[PDB]
Design a protein around this nucleic acid. Structure first.
Ligand SMILES: [Mg+2]
Ligand SMILES: [Zn+2]
Lengths: 251, 145, 292, 156, 131, 104
RNA sequence: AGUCUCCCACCAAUUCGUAUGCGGAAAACGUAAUGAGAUUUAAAAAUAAUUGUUUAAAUCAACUCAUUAAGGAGGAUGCCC
RNA sequence: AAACCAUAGUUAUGACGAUUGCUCUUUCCCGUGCUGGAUCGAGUAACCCAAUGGAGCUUACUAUUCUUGGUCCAUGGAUU
């Protein structure tokens, strides 16, 4: 195949100005294609039931949040007007004098002992917290915690972009996708706390009191807590930029 | 974002340094006595080495290092003594000053380097060279009378 | 805050044994760096990729930060990190980075070829991309590759400490640095000093003057040495210490105990942090109201 | 033959296509140019940007979703005035889905005009339209075949 | 209605890390000038040597050099590059730029050399603005 | 992740979810009941393991998601009324006012 | 900038003779009212183009899909009156 | 053998000087205030660059690395 190539080279030296380019940039196709370019019933029932339960639970959670947000304001204003500082006084007062408004307010005194211990036992048995601490594995424990469930957990905001969100402790009731739901207590504060996750740092401490008084210092990062696997593994991860964490080093 | 190049056109002119011989005063006579010819010992690597030596001797170390990154002689022939050197747009003035500060060749003495046209494209350089060559013939034809 | 990430170690292959004079010169240069002023220093350990890597873990890191550097840091007042540069030329089969990346903190690369450069930019999980400023560049660096790599992670490193070595090396150093700055769009640039003795060290103003003479502005130089250095340290610290940026074993209560800052507290043979109980459920939530 | 068969289709080979026909090309070039055939320069000039056009795609087209949905409606499925327009649009959509290639490519598989029985529907709806009491000699009678009448308003 | 930059001050200091050699060997004012000329000639050609500069308040490894605003970069880049070798001491010398000032307001000690320099440049600043 | 330690983690997570689905709020708060019910079911769907029909029949509510419970730990009752047939057997609750009836 | 789409000759018609929410020559084009949806879905994921992150998954906001043909006349309701 | 044609046209859009305007901070004044005036300064950015023309869509931009308008059943403080 020398002669016909030379002939088409002489053919290109008439039209084109540099005849040897189409062969080097591979612009002369040797081939050109000529072709037109070319037990089910219960399953349905349970799927409908689950969809309905989800759609109802969402509205129920929204209405519960709204009711709590209104009741905190109302009770706090009534307490400020009522010449009352202590919580044990305001609680009993609104008990005797405001029957209905008391059925909606929550009781953190019972929210602590059930949730905290049932979460601590589960995490202790999951991370294999033993009387001895010579049987640990850091990377595997980190993988487990990334896979672990954090419903009913105590978390503290230690660092945040906002200077006011830091230092808040609370037990969560539901894990959303953008906001974080907890409950905090004070002398008269019973605020349901909705805190943003974009730009905040959390931490959770596990008590260990075999013989000495020790605790594990763990922490999570909300910014990258949204793209984690849930309850299992085997998900393709992507390096994002690892650049929007300047607030961590700044302060 | 985009590599900006700038070519410089330079010419070698030999002044008639001879006080024992009287000269004719006109346009084409001095044009011919200044554009006589270049010597045989003339090349591209011999002019590039000379200009590199001159640049390193006049500017210095960093002054030669910054210009010697894209310092090349693209087209030059000894028949007419016109050459086109490629350089950057940042160090173009330094290359022009080095061409001005060119003292002499290692074997040939008494010559001047004249920068004529500088631009960022070779097509306009060739067009200006053709225009200058056409203009040169006019005074020659007029003086041959 | 000033960070120097390219302090070379007097050793290239594991067959070498470092004498006391070299570690004493390193002690002297660390004291010199602390005298004028510095905040973070990460020493480098260069090794080649082709030869076999020892099948050990407790023998892969010949730095011993705790024994000698831990003995001098209480008098010095700064922290040290271990870094390794993988000089890769051809895609050989010897590749066990899953151990070296976990044993070390920061992993960099020094490619010589184009295929090695492409594979290290795409597939190799590294932190910094260093070029041989002593030798010539492999080929013409493109813009899109460097920009996509900066957006994806790994940035380029400029070593101004090499220009103090020889006389003919400065020309190639400048010719490489200008091309790197032009092709990287002046975004992912981290500057380091590759000096083996305290005789070739400079002040921050000298570095600023040299870089601004090279072509990069001074404010961008300060920005890249202040925040881009801390971020590239945090990346290499969190990708190893923590998981893939989901759970961190370090808890910052105030402003001094950070995963990159707190180095003596966080255990390294494991990843636990034994701290006394400071968070119970009976304390008031509001930190302004919570008083001890 | 310069072309070949394949499992996919019928392909053409350029090599033999021009190698077999060389003397014909030489005769054509000598018939076009007589004095410049022996020379070797650039004869043909570049295309002016004004005459230059752009390249389209190799697909046919993409149908809108509304027309496709209405075609699906009609295919799967005294009269009031709106039921006249409904039947007219129904026959129009059937004719479209019959002729249109984009609509056919947007139609669902296992659906053809024979199974949908387009012809009987067309006949029934045309019977409805002819029952719709058309007044043709009230519309007007024109002069030619292509629509061209006079729009002249006297004192208005 | 603006200000013309006459020159810029540069706080230099020879910093060699050997006290055993520093206390033994002495450094005078001609050494500084010789080192500057050698640095200029080794890093640059005549371009670097033609830099205008004087000496003010020479001390033990402390000196104040005024350099024009036009070649401040050329000065500060050659200062941070060169390292003395076999000039006057067997131990190499290098200079570290302490700070820079463009308004004569700088703080070292309670001496009056700065004061008489300021006197001269006061009677010259008013003179240059008036003329 | 090792398979032997992954199986154990699976059973532990299932146990923890079912335990949190019990004590105070999943009984009282219908919102949290539905939420933790949805979470447990999304967790058992990801493992693709069949669930026991014996409990799946009368497991929870379909309107809110509370345990169907009539009247060591005194707690709240889930179902307030459970009539006879009266035409056909049905069950009602307190958390909401809907009732679910099954035919013999 | 981008491997996205389309116009840049006509065709009383084998030539998308398409009166189909509105504008538009076309657009793998802009926007408006209502209802619903989340690998348990019409379809996005943890067995044509583009984007480092790449819709949502308390409420809002954002994406996708499913309906509403142009003009004139009569009755009822609501507002200034 | 040409159809050769751009109020940029084939990867050219260079070198500095001067003036006005904008952001915050430094101070003064009348009458709190004013698209108020006057100095002492800094900044005028980032994304990126045409190669025949127009429209639609998507994707990169604006942290002491110029700006502007509005919203938020986001939190932080104060009054009712
Ligand atoms: Mg382009
Ligand atoms: Zn219910």
């Amino acid at each position: 195949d020398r002669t016909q190539t030379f002939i088409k080279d002489c053919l290109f030296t008439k039209c084109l100005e540099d005849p040897e380019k189409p062969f080097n940039e591979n612009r002369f196709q040797d081939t050109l294609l000529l072709l037109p370019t070319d037990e089910s019933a219960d399953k349905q029932l349970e799927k409908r039931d689950y969809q309905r339960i989800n759609k109802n639970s969402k509205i129920a959670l929204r209405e519960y949040i709204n009711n709590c947000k209104k009741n905190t304001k109302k009770c706090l204003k009534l307490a400020y007007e009522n010449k009352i500082t202590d919580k044990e006084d305001l609680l009993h007062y609104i008990e005797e004098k405001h029957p209905t408004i008391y059925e909606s307010l929550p009781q953190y005194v019972d929210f602590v002992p059930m949730y905290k211990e049932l979460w601590i036992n589960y995490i202790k048995e999951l991370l294999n917290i033993t009387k001895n601490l010579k049987t640990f594995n850091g990377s595997l424990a980190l993988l487990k915690l990334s896979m672990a469930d954090y419903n009913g957990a105590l978390l503290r905001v230690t660092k945040s972009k906002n200077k006011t969100l830091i230092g808040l402790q609370g037990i969560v009731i539901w894990d959303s996708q953008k906001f974080f739901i907890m409950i905090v207590k004070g002398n008269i504060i019973d605020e349901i706390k909705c805190i943003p996750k974009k730009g905040t740092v959390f931490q959770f401490e596990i008590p260990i009191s075999d013989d000495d008084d020790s605790a594990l210092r763990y922490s999570i990062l909300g910014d990258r807590f949204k793209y984690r696997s849930v309850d299992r593994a085997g998900r393709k991860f992507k390096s994002r930029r690892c650049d929007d964490m300047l607030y961590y080093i700044q302060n | 974002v985009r590599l900006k190049s700038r070519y410089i056109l330079f010419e070698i002119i030999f002044p008639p340094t001879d006080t024992n011989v009287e000269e004719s005063v006109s346009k084409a006579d001095i044009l011919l006595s200044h554009h006589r010819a270049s010597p045989a010992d003339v090349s591209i690597k011999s002019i590039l080495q000379e200009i590199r030596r001159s640049l390193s001797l006049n500017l210095g170390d960093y002054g030669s290092a910054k210009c010697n990154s894209l310092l090349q002689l693209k087209y030059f022939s000894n028949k007419t003594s016109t050459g086109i050197i490629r350089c950057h747009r940042e160090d173009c003035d330094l290359v022009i000053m080095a061409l001005m500060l060119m003292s002499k060749i290692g074997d040939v003495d008494g010559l001047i380097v004249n920068p004529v046209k500088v631009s960022g494209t070779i097509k306009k350089i060739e067009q200006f060279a053709m225009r200058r060559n056409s203009k040169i013939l006019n005074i020659i034809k007029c003086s041959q009378s | 805050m000033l960070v120097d990430l390219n302090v070379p170690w007097p050793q290239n292959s594991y067959a070498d044994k470092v004498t006391s004079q070299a570690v004493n010169n390193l002690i002297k240069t660390l004291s010199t760096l602390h005298m004028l002023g510095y905040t973070h220093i990460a020493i480098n350990f260069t090794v080649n990729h082709s030869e076999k890597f020892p099948n050990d873990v407790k023998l892969l890191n010949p730095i011993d930060i705790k024994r000698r550097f831990g003995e001098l840091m209480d008098r010095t007042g700064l922290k040290l990190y271990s870094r390794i540069t993988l000089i890769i030329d051809d895609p050989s089969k010897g590749q066990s980075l899953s151990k070296i990346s976990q044993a070390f903190d920061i992993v960099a690369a020094l490619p010589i070829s184009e295929k090695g450069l492409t594979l290290s930019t795409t597939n190799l999980d590294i932190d910094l991309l260093t070029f041989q400023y002593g030798s010539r560049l492999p080929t013409f660096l493109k813009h899109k590759s460097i920009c996509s790599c900066v957006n994806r992670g790994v940035k380029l490193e400029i070593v101004y400490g090499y220009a103090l070595r020889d006389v003919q090396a400065r020309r190639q150093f400048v010719s490489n640095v200008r091309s790197v700055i032009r092709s990287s769009r002046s975004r992912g640039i981290v500057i380091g000093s590759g000096a083996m003795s305290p005789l070739e060290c400079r002040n921050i103003l000298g570095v600023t003057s040299l870089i601004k003479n090279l072509g990069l502005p001074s404010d961008r130089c300060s920005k890249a040495m202040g925040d881009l250095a801390s971020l590239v340290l945090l990346n290499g610290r969190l990708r190893n210490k923590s998981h893939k940026q989901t759970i961190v074993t370090g808890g910052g209560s105030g402003n001094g105990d950070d995963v990159v800052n707190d180095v003596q507290g966080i255990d390294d043979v494991q990843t636990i942090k034994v701290v006394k109980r400071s968070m119970d459920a009976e304390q008031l939530g509001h930190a302004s109201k919570r008083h001890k | 033959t310069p072309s070949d068969l394949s499992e996919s289709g019928s392909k053409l080979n350029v090599d033999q296509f021009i190698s077999s026909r060389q003397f014909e090309v030489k005769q054509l070039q000598l018939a076009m140019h007589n004095s410049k055939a022996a020379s070797s320069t650039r004869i043909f000039q570049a295309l002016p940007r004004k005459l230059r056009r752009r390249t389209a795609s190799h697909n046919v087209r993409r149908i809108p979703k509304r027309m496709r949905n209405r075609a699906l409606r009609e295919m799967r499925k005294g009269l009031n005035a709106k039921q006249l327009y409904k039947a007219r649009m129904s026959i129009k959509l059937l004719r479209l889905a019959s002729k249109s290639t984009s609509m056919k490519l947007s139609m669902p598989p296992e659906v053809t005009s024979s199974n949908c029985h387009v012809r009987q529907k067309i006949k029934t709806l045309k019977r409805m339209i002819k029952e719709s009491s058309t007044a043709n000699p009230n519309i007007k009678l024109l002069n030619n075949r292509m629509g061209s009448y006079d729009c002249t308003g006297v004192n208005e | 209605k603006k200000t013309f930059r006459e020159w810029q001050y540069f706080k230099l200091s020879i910093t060699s890390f050997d006290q055993d050699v520093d206390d033994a060997h002495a450094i005078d004012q001609m050494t500084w000038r010789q080192w500057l000329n050698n640095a200029l000639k080794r890093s640059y050609g005549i371009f670097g040597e033609g830099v205008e500069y004087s000496f003010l308040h020479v001390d033990d490894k402390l000196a104040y050099i005024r350099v024009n605003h036009a070649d401040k970069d050329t000065f500060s880049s050659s200062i941070s590059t060169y390292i003395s070798t076999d000039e006057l001491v067997g131990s190499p010398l290098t200079v570290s730029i302490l700070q820079e000032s463009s308004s004569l307001r700088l703080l070292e000690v309670t001496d009056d050399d700065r004061l008489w320099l300021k006197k001269v440049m006061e009677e010259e600043e008013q003179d240059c603005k008036c003329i | 992740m090792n398979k032997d330690q992954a199986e154990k983690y699976q059973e532990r997570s299932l146990r923890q979810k079912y335990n949190l689905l019990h004590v105070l709020p999943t009984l009282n708060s219908r919102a949290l009941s539905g939420l933790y019910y949805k979470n447990f079911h999304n967790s058992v769907k990801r493992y693709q393991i069949m669930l026991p029909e014996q409990l799946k029949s009368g497991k929870f509510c379909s309107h809110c998601g509370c345990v169907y419970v009539p009247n060591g730990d005194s707690d709240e009752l889930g179902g307030e009324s459970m009539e006879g047939p009266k035409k056909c057997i049905q069950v009602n609750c307190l958390n909401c006012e809907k009732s679910k009836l099954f035919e013999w």
